[PDB]
Design a protein around this ligand. Structure first.
Ligand SMILES: Nc1ncnc2c1ncn2[C@@H]1O[C@H](COP(=O)(O)OP(=O)(O)O)[C@@H](O)[C@H]1O
Length: 233
């Protein structure tokens, strides 16, 4: 049993977050977050460490469940979808994506691609450089949770997978290849990402305090200005 039974066949990529709240015990880490992301936009989430950014993105994949509010995918509450369906519409790029104790190839293929299709993606992801050096190349086992790979290597494997999956929604913990041609929710750490984002959502203590484009936000001389000046970490 799961909360949802709906299997959306074709998803455009509109994501609606409304009145979203979450807490770890008595520590409220998200409070009434509301953001509407239209299909194809790149929305950058910024804020000091601990502002709730990672937790928000995890909630989208249902790695945690919100205490209040909703996440809609093309207007359908994500909890009404099967988890397999929901995740079929999402690509996650981070250092913490779950990897199977299996080969590089099978980790990329899971969820039908040729070996040359996978090699081509590894290169574009700049991942083939370490994968070549592996004992069995693309057929090398990467260990429990990809433990034979360090964080940056694991992220590059997630990129290769995203290049192939062509998911309508990309959740990226921080390329122009994907980011542009799908809906991108990016936890931004590069100045270039916020400078070019369609919308920036500024978080502070789990709350959205500012929202807009770089030029207007920078001029406001507020939290975003301070975050941009300090290098988004
Ligand atoms: N498993 C957990 N148990 C308790 N608190 C947590 C846990 N994971 C994260 N937190 C806390 O939730 C808050 C939000 O963290 P996070 O969502 O990672 O923010 P950001 O990505 O903006 O740095 C932080 O104060 C963090 O310590």
């Amino acid at each position: 049993k799961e909360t949802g039974s709906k299997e959306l066949a074709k998803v455009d990529g509109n994501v609606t977050i409304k009145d979203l709240s979450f807490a770890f015990g008595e520590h409220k880490v998200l409070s009434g977050v509301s953001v509407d992301i239209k299909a194809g936009q790149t929305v950058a989430f910024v804020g000091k460490s601990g502002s709730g950014k990672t937790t928000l993105t995890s909630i989208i994949s249902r790695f945690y469940t919100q205490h209040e509010g909703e996440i809609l995918l093309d207007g359908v509450d994500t909890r009404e979808l099967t988890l397999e369906n929901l995740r079929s519409h999402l690509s996650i790029v981070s250092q913490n994506v779950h990897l199977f104790d299996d080969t590089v190839y099978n980790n990329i293929a899971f969820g039908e691609v040729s070996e040359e299709e996978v090699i081509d993606a590894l290169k574009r992801a700049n991942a083939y450089e370490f994968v070549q050096e592996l004992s069995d190349g693309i057929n090398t086992n990467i260990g429990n949770n990809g433990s034979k790979l360090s964080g940056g290597q694991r992220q590059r494997i997630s990129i290769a997978r995203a290049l192939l999956k062509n998911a309508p929604v990309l959740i990226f913990d921080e390329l122009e290849s994907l980011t542009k041609s799908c809906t991108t929710i990016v936890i931004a750490h590069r100045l270039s990402t916020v400078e070019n984002a369609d919308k920036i959502v500024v978080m502070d203590g789990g709350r959205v305090v500012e929202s807009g484009k770089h030029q207007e936000l920078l001029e406001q001389g507020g939290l975003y200005t301070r975050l941009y000046q300090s290098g988004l970490q």
